[PDB]
């Protein structure tokens, strides 16, 4: 029911981040993945970030197929959370799950405090 619960996060943790911080689907999809770790099609199934990234890419393709099936203008990007998916799993593959997850938690404590009390340094 929650995609991130087993990876150690939740949808609310990724909701804390500003929506403009995440890259688009083009750079997160076309760049990043398929550039780094070019061949993941090996019949292996390593750490589940891979097997979630698979159904994530195939899922976004089965989405874009239905979106381009229409062609009274300007469809919606509200149905796009897959930047959170791809950025999460890809960042967890490149930097490790523990690093990006600790970034999600530490940033979760950046917001949730009154801005007048905030420390001089923002999470990275």
């Amino acid at each position, epitope marked *: 029911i*929650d995609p991130y*619960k087993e990876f*150690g*996060a*939740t949808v*609310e*943790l990724l909701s*804390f981040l500003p929506s403009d911080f995440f890259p688009s689907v083009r750079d997160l999809l076309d760049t990043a993945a398929a550039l780094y770790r070019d061949a993941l099609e090996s019949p292996e199934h390593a750490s589940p970030h891979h097997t979630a990234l698979r159904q994530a890419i195939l899922c976004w393709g089965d989405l874009m197929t239905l979106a381009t099936w229409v062609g009274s203008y300007v469809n919606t990007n509200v149905g796009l959370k897959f930047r959170q998916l791809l950025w999460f799993h890809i960042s967890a593959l490149t930097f490790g799950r*523990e690093t990006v*997850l*600790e970034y*999600l*938690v*530490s*940033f*979760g*404590v*950046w917001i*949730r*405090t*009154p801005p007048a*009390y*905030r*420390p*001089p*340094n*923002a*999470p*990275i």
Partner: antibody
Amino acid sequence: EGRLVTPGTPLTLTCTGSGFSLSTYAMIWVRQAPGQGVEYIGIINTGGSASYASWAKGRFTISRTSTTVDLKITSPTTEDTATYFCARTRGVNDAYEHAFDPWGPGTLVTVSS
Amino acid sequence: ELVMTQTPSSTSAAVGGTVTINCQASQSIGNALAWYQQKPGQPPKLLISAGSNLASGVPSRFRGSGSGTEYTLTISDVQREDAATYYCLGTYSAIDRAFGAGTNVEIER
């Protein structure tokens, strides 16, 4: 490993820990009564901003310098006798951090006549 | 004000057996919870950061989990060296923090 102070006399515990050239960790303090659990006292940010817990507000004051981080107990009562630990964040962090692996050995403070 | 209610207090387990401690938060900290291990005459040894990061060479039998206001530290393989008191904190903000009452874990023998 221990410090004795008569009731009412303010004291200051100085904290370095593992410190060699550790200038910004946004360090925290904790006290533990004998046979009882740990209690959170407060933090001091990298800018010298000291945040306290509600119960410890006004009883303690957390200072710091470039080379040291200090905790002053003002008018210590008999209820304040306990072991005091100081713990620093791991890495960049600085006051947004939820967990600190490095810990000082602790100093046992006894308030008695 | 944030307060962490911690469960069983004293608990017992046998070598190879399992023991589960759970930490309940009065306010959702978003996996800001952390698990610490402490033995008498020693400062606390950090077990886990966030939900799952058991850091710096901690035996993999310590497994944290939970989200929102509900968290758990599970010791799967119980060893005689694991008898000790475990504490959970959690941090709401950079201001408010609180410690649990602690859980005393004894090895059955």
